[PDB]
């Protein structure tokens, strides 16, 4: 889409309709005349288009009105109400951008942000953008959180997220214009190579993918059309629904074969019964013909009974002879209906070992996409957010996805090597106790009005607790925390010094010996200018390969590589880096998923902020003091970098509304 309707779409917003969250800020317009609404939508929409057209500089109210046209630029209070609404919820003036109206001399309010992960920096810049006092506490010695880029010499490779899942409606699209980062399109063609070292033929390769895609749809049928979502009081996982689908089809192969072979025995019994009638016809013919020859011996002139018995036997024998030919002609038809059936038997097996070994690889990829074994994804919900997909090609960063978080950190107050370890939120404010990672003796106390918590769900999940909440989080929260899934996925970075792969191929897969290792080093990427190959460990392989030394993982990687490229063409790598996100204390995992028994409505529970109890009994219910952002708090966009950033934007909006007041809801 283009025009002002494109600005709405590029902002994840219906152009022709007013959102739940615009209704709450503009209830007068929602219940008003359908014409004022349309006014509003165009009054809105337009504004986003100006922001998008030049996102490197602040979009001030004055400029917006100046470029709005009659009759829209009349009700200035509406344009004020709109431009304030957007700026506040970070649909405009978010990211880098030169500031037309430099920041206020005196700040109001004090928020501590836990973690300078991408969500963290997003809120921070926004809150600071809003005249607030922001301080970010990072346990690491670098920013970016799960956005981690490895740079040595000219080698560059992300250990963290490395793809921009399409610019259609992507806020990263705005950031790209702002922070120049080299985005490279990813050629989707991917050829698989079995363990033997030989490429799978296209006919099998196309044949297998379609079955996998068909199989997925099948599960959806089970879920939505047959209410297959509980089983012995437990919730059905996608993995369970895949086996039961494959099983039902295997069964159906056997069902077809039994029908085909039963058709055979039906004919053979007819044929065998038909033969019996032909023997017992022939022997009747044998016997008569004797009688005829015997009766014929009486020589003429014979009296007429003897003459009858000659002619009489002749009719009988011929009569039985025309029978036996009809029978040997029904024979003829059934003896070919039997080579027809042998000529057209059904399929031997639904799937052979080679097939299931390639179909493993397609499941490995699905486990990579969800960072978890398919036996954990909820059947009903694992793809709840599979509707807000961005459009366009997926892309990589050629210069390290680490540049984005580093760009965001510019001019913010970040305490590095600062491990928050206890959060105390009270009616009158909060204090955060953090220690020093380098030296754990050194203790720090941080007092503030609100605390924004971008702690990964893995860190949030840990027993015993990496971080103490006093008072404890309420059960409605903690139980949402156990229900959700935090998955794992790891990468191996192979740093060579010759280029020996098909350079025109970004990605190519390795097929596993077994279902159990379907994720083990199953896929490689040539994304980087330098000679760098990068290899994935997903599914059940993921958590296991963390118990194995680099040199073993690297050795296995080279072996798969040698078998596919020739044992001579594969040098030793000059640098090697293996990731351990599950092991990592500041992540305890990779990103999240919708575990069996969860739903996208846990992701909403995660975002609801906590309002603490009254200090003195009978005191009025206070302000909410603790809030939550990061990848696991945004329902329509979990487990991405853009999703985490949007949650940051979200809370900065929510924070500011609570402590700076909303002056746009009149």
């Amino acid at each position: 889409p283009s025009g002002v309707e494109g600005a709405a779409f590029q902002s994840r917003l219906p152009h022709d309709r007013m959102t739940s969250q615009e209704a709450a800020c503009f209830p007068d317009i929602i219940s008003g005349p359908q014409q004022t609404q349309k006014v509003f939508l165009f009054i809105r929409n337009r504004t986003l288009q100006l922001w998008l057209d030049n996102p490197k500089i602040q979009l001030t109210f004055e400029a917006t009105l100046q470029q709005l046209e009659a009759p829209y630029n009349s009700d200035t209070v509406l344009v004020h109400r709109v431009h304030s609404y957007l700026e506040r919820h970070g649909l405009i003036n978010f990211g880098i951008y030169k500031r037309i109206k430099p920041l206020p001399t005196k700040k109001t309010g004090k928020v501590i942000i836990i973690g300078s992960g991408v969500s963290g920096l997003a809120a921070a810049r926004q809150l600071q953008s809003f005249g607030m006092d922001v301080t970010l506490l990072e346990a690491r010695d670098r920013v970016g959180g799960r956005v981690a880029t490895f740079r040595k010499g000219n080698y560059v490779a992300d250990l963290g997220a490395m793809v921009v899942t399409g610019l259609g409606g992507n806020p990263m699209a705005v950031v790209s214009k702002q922070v120049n980062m080299e985005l490279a399109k990813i050629k989707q063609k991917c050829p698989l190579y079995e363990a033997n070292g030989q490429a799978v033929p296209k006919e099998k390769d196309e044949m297998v993918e379609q079955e996998f895609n068909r199989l997925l749809e099948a599960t959806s049928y089970l879920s939505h059309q047959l209410d297959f979502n509980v089983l012995n009081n437990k919730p059905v996982s996608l993995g369970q629904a895949l086996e039961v689908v494959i099983q039902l089809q295997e069964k159906h192969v056997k069902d077809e074969q039994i029908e085909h072979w039963k058709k055979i025995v039906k004919t053979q019994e007819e044929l065998k019964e038909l033969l019996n009638k032909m023997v017992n016809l022939k022997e009747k013919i044998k016997e008569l013909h004797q009688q005829y020859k015997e009766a014929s011996e009486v020589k003429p002139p014979r009296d007429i009974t003897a003459e009858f018995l000659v002619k009489s036997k002749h009719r009988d024998l011929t009569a039985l002879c025309k029978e036996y030919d009809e029978l040997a002609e029904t024979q003829g038809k059934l003896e070919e209906k039997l080579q027809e059936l042998e000529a057209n038997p059904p399929s031997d097996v639904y799937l052979s070992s080679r097939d299931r070994q390639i179909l493993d690889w397609h499941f490995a990829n699905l486990e990579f996409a969800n960072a978890t074994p398919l036996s954990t994804l909820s059947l009903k919900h694992w793809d709840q957010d599979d509707d807000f997909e961005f459009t366009g090609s997926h892309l990589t960063v050629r210069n390290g996805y680490s540049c984005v978080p580093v760009a965001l950190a510019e001019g913010l107050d970040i305490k590095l090597n600062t491990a928050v370890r206890q959060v105390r939120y009270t009616a009158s404010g909060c204090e955060v106790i953090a220690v020093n990672t380098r030296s754990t003796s050194q203790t720090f106390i941080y007092k503030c009005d609100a605390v924004l918590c971008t702690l990964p769900l893995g860190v949030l999940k840990q027993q015993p607790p990496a971080v103490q909440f006093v008072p404890p989080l309420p059960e409605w929260k903690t139980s949402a925390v156990q229900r959700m899934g935090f998955g794992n996925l790891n990468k191996v970075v192979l740093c060579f010094d010759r280029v020996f792969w098909d350079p025109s191929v970004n990605l190519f897969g390795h097929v596993g010996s077994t279902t159990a290792s379907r994720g083990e080093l199953f896929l490689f990427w040539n994304l980087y200018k330098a000679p760098i190959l990068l290899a994935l460990v997903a599914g059940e392989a993921a958590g296991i390969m963390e118990n194995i030394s680099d040199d073993v993982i690297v050795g296995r990687c080279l072996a798969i590589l040698k078998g596919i490229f020739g044992s001579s063409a594969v040098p030793q790598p000059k640098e090697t880096v293996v990731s351990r996100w599950r092991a990592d204390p500041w992540a305890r995992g990779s990103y999240s998923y919708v575990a069996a028994g969860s739903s996208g409505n846990d992701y909403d529970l995660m975002a609801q902020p906590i309002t603490p109890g009254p200090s003195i009994p009978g005191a009025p219910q206070p302000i909410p003091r603790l809030f939550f952002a990061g990848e696991h708090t945004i329902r329509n966009y979990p487990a991405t970098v853009h999703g985490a950033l949007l949650s940051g934007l979200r809370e900065a909006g929510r924070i500011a509304d609570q402590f700076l007041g909303a002056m746009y809801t009149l």
């Binding site: 793809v163 899942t165 399409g166 990813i186 989707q188 991917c190 990829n365 699905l366 990579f368 996409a369 969800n370 994804l377 694992w382 793809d383 957010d385 599979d386 997909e389 459009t391 366009g392 090609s393 997926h394 990605l507 999240s592 998923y593 919708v594 979990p638 487990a639």
Partner: peptide, 8 residues
Amino acid sequence: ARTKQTAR
């Protein structure tokens, strides 16, 4: 979650 490296 859902499925990556594709434009659907």
